[PDB]
């Protein structure tokens, strides 16, 4: 079961959403600026996407 | 009827309650997404919001801060859940918006508010993979000023031999808390590393949710407030103990579990921590 997408680092947020939803079609995706602080709850259905100021993925996406 | 979530029993909080100690007069800041002050199983004493577009700290548009607050301090009554320190003075310091995120400056502003308002304990069920000098200075200032500072270790799991503890938990001045389940096994998501300090229950933790609800959440977010609540119980029994002494009491009386890279010092035991003489069980 795929739960992390290191191959998506440096891709566009659009391609990352497409790829994650093929692997996990029920994923709840939230896009946030890289370098923000977030709450530390673990949610199996969620995938956070941290982007740089260009809207490219800046951190390995993972479930949680 | 009230229910005692398993994690409150697991850290031995009922032994302190039976001695008559429940966190009375101890001020705990939940630096988080707000706390729903209308919930009948919580009493919010005060607070402030650092989120520019969400100015009411007593409205929790995410749910997370309300759940964390209930593990710290849900009231002792005939409803809902019981908190670790049910008489603590609970402060809602809102630094995360509805989406569960905040800028480093908002978190720092919340820590500063906590210091200026003489909080005894800060809980930060929050974090990120990089530090900043300004964040380190704010946590170090709080600790220098006498505050017990507790944070979630993070939910990054393992990565070979690398530490995966996030900030602010990874700073030496902060107590970083990892998650175990009811069998004392480390949760697979719980961050690891030499900066992991202690563990507490963080799997299927029942607590308060906004609009007079209850529910089970998972995370190092859920483990941190057991330790922040335990610090409030200890200070209620020993009001002159310093933050240094409260932290050492918790560290020196854990029930040791596995290797420290994965479990730190083990599971907290607030009964043993609040005795004068400390040892591990
Ligand atoms: Ca109650
Ligand atoms: Na630390």
Nearest Cα to B170, choosing from B234, B107, B124? B124
- Provide the token pair at B51: 């989120």
Residues of B in contact with A36 (CB under 8 A): 101-104, 128
Locate the domains of chain B by residue range.
Answer: 1-281
**CA B279 – CA B189 distance, rounded (Å):** 29
**CA B263 – CA B132 distance, rounded (Å):** 26
Method: X-ray
Q: A34 vs chain B: nearest CA distance in angstroms?
A: 9
- Provide the token pair at B25: 């007069």
- Token look-up 């029920």 returns A26
Residue B198's H or E segment, with its range, is strand B198-201
∠ CA A57-A60-A62, nearest 5°, is 115
Q: Which residue of A has its CA nearest to B124?
A: A39
Name the resolution in angstroms.
1.6
Chain B contact present for A59, CB below 8 A: yes
**CA B207 – CA B236 distance, rounded (Å):** 22
**CA B71 – CA B218 distance, rounded (Å):** 12
Chain B contact present for A27, CB below 8 A: no
Q: Residue B185 carries which DSSP code?
A: P
Phi, psi of B171 (to 5 degrees): -65, 135
> How would you class B29 by CB atoms within 10 Å of its CB: exposed for 0-12, middle for 13-18, buried for 19 or more?
buried
**CA B91 – CA B85 distance, rounded (Å):** 13
**CA B22 – CA B1 distance, rounded (Å):** 19
**CA A51 – CA A33 distance, rounded (Å):** 5
Helix (H, G, I), strand (E, B) or coil at B109: helix
- Which domains does chain A show, CATH number per domain? 1-64 (3.30.10.10)
**CA B42 – CA B85 distance, rounded (Å):** 11
Beta-ladder partners of B102: A37
- Provide the token pair at A63: 């479930």
* Strand ranges of the sheet holding B101-102, from the earlier edge strand across to the other edge: B101-102, A37-39, B126-127
Helix (H, G, I), strand (E, B) or coil at B197: coil
- Provide the token pair at A56: 């490219």
Contact B218 A41 (CB under 8 A): yes
Render the burial of B98-124: b for 16+ CB within 10 Å, e for the rest: ebbbbbbebbbbbbebbbeeebbbbbb
Four-point Cα dihedral B144, B146, B147, B152, nearest 10:
50
Contact B126 A35 (CB under 8 A): no
Query: B157, B190 in Cβ contact below 8 A?
Result: yes
Q: Residue B104 carries which DSSP code?
A: H
Put simply, the chain B residues between 37 and 66 with a CB less than 8 A from any chain A CB are 62, 64
Could you tell me how many helices (H) and strands (E) chain B has, helices first?
Answer: 9, 11
**CA B164 – CA B195 distance, rounded (Å):** 9
CATH superfamily of B1-281: Peptidase S8/S53 domain (3.40.50.200)
> How would you class B161 by CB atoms within 10 Å of its CB: exposed for 0-12, middle for 13-18, buried for 19 or more?
exposed
Beta-ladder partners of B48: B93
Q: Tell me if residue B64 is catalytic.
A: yes
């Amino acid at each position: 079961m795929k739960t992390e997408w290191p191959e998506l680092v440096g891709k566009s947020v659009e391609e990352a959403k497409k790829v994650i939803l093929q692997d996990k079609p029920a994923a709840q995706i939230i896009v946030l600026p890289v370098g923000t602080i977030v709450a530390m709850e673990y949610r199996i259905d969620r995938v956070r996407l941290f982007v740089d100021r260009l809207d490219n993925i800046a951190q390995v996406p993972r479930v949680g | 009827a009230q229910s005692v979530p398993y994690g409150v029993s697991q850290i031995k909080a009922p032994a302190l309650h039976s001695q008559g100690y429940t966190g009375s007069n101890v001020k705990v800041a939940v630096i988080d997404s707000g706390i729903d002050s209308s919930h009948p199983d919580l009493k919010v004493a005060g607070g402030a919001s650092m989120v520019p577009s969400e100015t009411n700290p007593f409205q929790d548009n995410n749910s997370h801060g309300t759940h964390v607050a209930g593990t710290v301090a849900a009231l002792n009554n005939s409803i809902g859940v019981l908190g670790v320190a049910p008489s603590a003075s609970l402060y809602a310091v809102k630094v995360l918006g509805a989406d569960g995120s905040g800028q480093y400056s908002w978190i720092i502003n919340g820590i500063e508010w906590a210091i200026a308002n003489n909080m005894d304990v800060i809980n930060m069920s929050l974090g990120g993979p990089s530090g900043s000098a300004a964040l380190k200075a704010a946590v170090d200032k709080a600790v220098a000023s006498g505050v017990v500072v507790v944070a979630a270790a993070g939910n990054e799991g393992t990565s070979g031999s690398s530490s995966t503890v996030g900030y602010p938990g990874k700073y030496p001045s902060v107590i970083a808390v990892g998650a175990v389940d009811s069998s004392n096994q480390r949760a697979s998501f719980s961050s690891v590393g030499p900066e992991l300090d202690v563990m507490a229950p963080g799997v299927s933790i029942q607590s308060t949710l906004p609009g007079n609800k209850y529910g089970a959440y998972n995370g190092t977010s859920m483990a941190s407030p057991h330790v922040a609540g335990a610090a409030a119980l200890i200070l209620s029994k020993h009001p002159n103990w310093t933050n240094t002494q409260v932290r050492s009491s918790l560290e020196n009386t854990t029930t040791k579990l596995g290797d420290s890279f994965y479990y730190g010092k083990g599971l907290i035991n607030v009964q043993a921590a609040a005795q004068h003489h400390h040892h591990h069980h």
